[PDB]
C-alpha cells in the first residue's frame with residue numbers, strides 16, 4: 001500500500017518536462033522494498049502527442065530479462081500531479097494488455113530541471129499490493145546524481161544513501177521506441 005501524498009515541485013514547468021524526450025531512472029527507492037528487485041533498468045519518454053499528455057515506459061530486469069513497455073495517457077489532478085492509465089505494448093505500440101480499470105499509477109514530479117528530476121509513483125495493478133516508489137531521473141543515462149536532485153531528496157525527508165542505483169546493470173535502452181510510443 002502507498003502512504004505518501006507527494007508534493008509537486010513549486011513552479012513545475014510542464015512543457016519542459018513533457019517535451020517528448022527520454023528520462024532514465026538512475027536511482028530508486030521502494031518504501032515496500034521487496035515489491036521490486038534490487039537490480040533493475042527503467043526509462044520513460046514524456047510528452048504531448050496530438051494534444052494528449054502521454055508517457056511511454058520501459059522496464060527491464062537485467063538478471064531475468066523480463067521486459068515490458070507501456071503507453072500511458074495522463075490526466076491532470078493538479079500541476080505536476082497526474083493519474084495515468086496504462087496499456088502494455090510491444091516496442092512498436094501494439095497492444096498486449098488493454099487499458100483496464102484498476103490498472104493505473106499516480107505520478108508526481110517533486111523536482112525537475114532541464115537535466116534531472118525526482119518523481120513519486122503509486123502503482124495499482126489488479127489485486128497486487130504495491131508501495132510508494134521514488135525515482136531519480138536524468139537525461140543522461142550515465143549521470144551521477146548531482147546536488148540539486150540530492151537536495152530535493154532531502155527536502156522530501158528521504159535519504160539518498162538508501163536509494164538503489166541502476167548504474168551497475170549494463171542497462172541499454174531503445175530511445176527511438178520510447179519516443180515513437182508517445183504517439184501510440
Ligand code: HEM
Nearest residue numbers: 025028036037040042059070086087088105121123128135
Ligand atoms: C519511472 C517511474 C516508473 C513508472 C511510472 C512505473 C510504472 C509501472 C507500471 C505502469 C507497471 C505495470 C506495467 C504493466 O503491467 O503493463 C510497472 C510494473 C513494475 N515496475 Fe515500474 N514504474 C517505474 C519505475 C520502476 C522502477 C524504478 C522499478 C524498480 C524495480 C520498477 C519495478 C517494477 C516492477 C517489478 C513491475 C512489475 C509489477 C508486477 O506486475 O508485479 N518500476 N511499473
Ligand SMILES: [N]
Nearest residue numbers: 036121123133
Ligand atoms: N513500478
Ligand SMILES: [Xe]
Nearest residue numbers: 042043057058
Ligand atoms: Xe519506467
